[PDB]
Amino acid sequence: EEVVVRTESGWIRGLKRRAEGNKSYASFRGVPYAKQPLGELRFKELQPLEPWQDELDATQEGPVCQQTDVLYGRIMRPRGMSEACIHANIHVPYYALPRDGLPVLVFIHGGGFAFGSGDSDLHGPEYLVSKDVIVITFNYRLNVYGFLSLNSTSVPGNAGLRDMVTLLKWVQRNAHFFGGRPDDVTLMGQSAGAAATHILSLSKAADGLFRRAILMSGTSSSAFFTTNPVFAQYINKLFVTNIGITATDPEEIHQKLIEMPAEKLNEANRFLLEQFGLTTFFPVVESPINGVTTILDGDPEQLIAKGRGKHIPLIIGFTDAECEIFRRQFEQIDIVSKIKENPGILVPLSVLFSSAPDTVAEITKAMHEKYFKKSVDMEGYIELCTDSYFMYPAISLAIKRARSNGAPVYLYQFSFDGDYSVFREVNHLNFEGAGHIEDLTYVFRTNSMLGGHASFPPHDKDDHMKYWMTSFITNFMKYSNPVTDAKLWPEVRADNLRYQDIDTPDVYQNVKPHSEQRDMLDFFDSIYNW
Numbered sequence: 279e280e281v282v283v284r285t286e287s288g289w290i291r292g293l294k295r296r297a298e299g300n301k302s303y304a305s306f307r308g309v310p311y312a313k314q315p316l317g318e319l320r321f322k323e324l325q326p327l328e329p330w331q332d333e334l335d336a337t338q339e340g341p342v343c344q345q346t347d348v349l350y351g352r353i354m355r356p357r358g359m360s361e362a363c364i365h366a367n368i369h370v371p372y373y374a375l376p377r378d379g380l381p382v383l384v385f386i387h388g389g390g391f392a393f394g395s396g397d398s399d400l401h402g403p404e405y406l407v408s409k410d411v412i413v414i415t416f417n418y419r420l421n422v423y424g425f426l427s428l429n430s431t432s433v434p435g436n437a438g439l440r441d442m443v444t445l446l447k448w449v450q451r452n453a454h455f456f457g458g459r460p461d462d463v464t465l466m467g468q469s470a471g472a473a474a475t476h477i478l479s480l481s482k483a484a485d486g487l488f489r490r491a492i493l494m495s496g497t498s499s500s501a502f503f504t505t506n507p508v509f510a511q512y513i514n515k516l517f518v519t520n521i522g523i524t525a526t527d528p529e530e531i532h533q534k535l536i537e538m539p540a541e542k543l544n545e546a547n548r549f550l551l552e553q554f555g556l557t558t559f560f561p562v563v564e565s566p567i568n569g570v571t572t573i574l575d576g577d578p579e580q581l582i583a584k585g586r587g588k589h590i591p592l593i594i595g596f597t598d599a600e601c602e603i604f605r606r607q608f609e610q611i612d613i614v615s616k617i618k619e620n621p622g623i624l625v626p627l628s629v630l631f632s633s634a635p636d637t638v639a640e641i642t643k644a645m646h647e648k649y650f651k652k653s654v655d656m657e658g659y660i661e662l663c664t665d666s667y668f669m670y671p672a673i674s675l676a677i678k679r680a681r682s683n684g685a686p687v688y689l690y691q692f693s694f695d696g697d698y699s700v701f702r703e704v705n706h707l708n709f710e711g712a713g714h715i716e717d718l719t720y721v722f723r724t725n726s727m728l729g730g731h732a733s734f735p736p737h738d739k740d741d742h743m744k745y746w747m748t749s750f751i752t753n754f755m756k757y758s759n760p761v762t763d764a765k766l767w768p769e770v771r772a773d774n775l776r777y778q779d780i781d782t783p784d785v786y787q788n789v790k791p792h793s794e795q796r797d798m799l800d801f802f803d804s805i806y807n808w
């Protein structure tokens with residue numbers, strides 16, 4: 279019932295739990311991977327862990343990083359919220375735990391960089407850990423805590439991404455203790471999580487922390503956000519303003535923030551949440567700064583152009599109807615109204631802050647005319663968001679990568695319309711196809727919503743998909759290929775783009791993109807190099 283293991287900084291006691299079927303795994307949750315960013319540490323890079331004595335309780339996840347969840351609703355059930363959220367959770371096939379190795383999976387959770395967690399409410403390791411692999415999830419600093427940017431020495435920006443690097447390093451040292459191979463770590467993420475993963479993959483400061491990666495609906499340059507420096511300044515100076523600060527010196531603004539109570543910050547960020555919908559702060563291209571681990575030293579797009587991350591083989595995913603999943607919140611913020619008021623919302627934040635005055639204008643035009651003929655309306659935006667924020671970015675990445683003489687790349691389109699869909703349930707949705715985050719649910723067990731359901735062996739259609747999806751994930755992390763028959767799901771070829779169409783459990787098929795998809799590509803290409 280109580281399992282014990284040693285880690286570099288001390289002993290920890292996890293729990294022996296059940297995976298699908300009879301399978302069992304040791305599970306250590308809430309383990310600290312660094313000093314908690316609590317005082318003068320709130321926004322600064324994570325400090326090393328003072329060692330501890332006795333056995334650290336790694337029975338369950340710890341609290342969740344300060345945030346305001348404008349999306350998950352009851353799907354996520356945090357055991358509390360605190361700035362002392364920097365913990366990871368490690369799950370391992372019981373038989374594999376050393377007592378004097380396995381491939382490991384590090385997962386970065388989505389939530390627009392502003393909310394979410396690495397908890398098992400949404401991230402159940404049950405399916406995965408049933409495939410002979412170690413699963414590692416964790417929390418990183420969110421919204422203002424992890425992405426504030428003062429282009430200063432104390433807050434150069436990207437603290438959130440640094441937390442990931444800190445944890446990937448912690449994994450390198452501690453992998454063996456769990457019976458895992460640090461030489462075979464696979465990084466995965468979805469949404470902001472996937473975008474962060476892609477970004478790390480371009481960071482020379484993350485070299486050697488993982489052998490390959492999985493991008494589930496997210497990329498370093500996906501349009502749903504921006505790494506633009508001007509924008510950072512804007513939103514930041516807009517926060518400090520709204521928050522009552524008046525100081526101007528980078529450091530002084532900092533101190534005031536350091537001494538500000540959590541709640542005052544949470545309210546001030548929830549202010550921006552109202553203004554932008556589902557995100558607030560973001561990663562930024564940073565300037566070199568004194569004694570600073572530069573996570574991002576350039577525009578992702580230009581970095582990629584020079585093959586800056588082409589040696590990390592990866593799986594690039596995206597769903598059928600990505601943004602159908604957001605309808606409920608699109609209404610709450612009333613995007614239709616917002617669009618009428620800000621016709622630039624249709625334009626990638628990255629272009630608005632980069633392109634030239636007349637340029638923007640014309641694009642702003644083009645975009646509007648493109649999805650809104652008779653009237654600015656919901657479905658029109660949902661189309662926009664899906665293509666622009668997910669589908670386009672994914673395919674454009676598959677293509678660009680396949681023609682840079684780099685590592686392999688596998689592209690997929692999740693279109694499976696499950697019998698049971700947690701997110702449509704919680705939000706009362708109704709649409710065809712697969713919306714954003716759903717493929718993630720056939721790889722992780724949504725423990726906060728399932729019951730005592732048994733998924734493996736599969737019997738219903740849905741569990742069969744669970745089996746198939748989690749198999750692509752473990753094969754990749756085992757053989758750097760999502761399939762055991764190289765021809766069932768071929769690497770991406772530039773001369774012939776095709777994606778594995780995930781739709782029916784146990785049926786392979788790489789197909790070309792539909793007409794619209796091709797049209798969307800061209801359209802979006804012309805727009806991006808206008």
Ligand SMILES: *[C@@](=O)([C]S[C][C][C][C][C][C][C][C])C(F)(F)F
Pocket residue numbers: 349387388389390391468469470471502554555556557604663714715
């Ligand atoms: C995921 O991390 C994707 S983040 C997408 C945020 C922008 C969506 C459009 C907002 C328009 C107002 C997750 F879904 F957040 F988890």
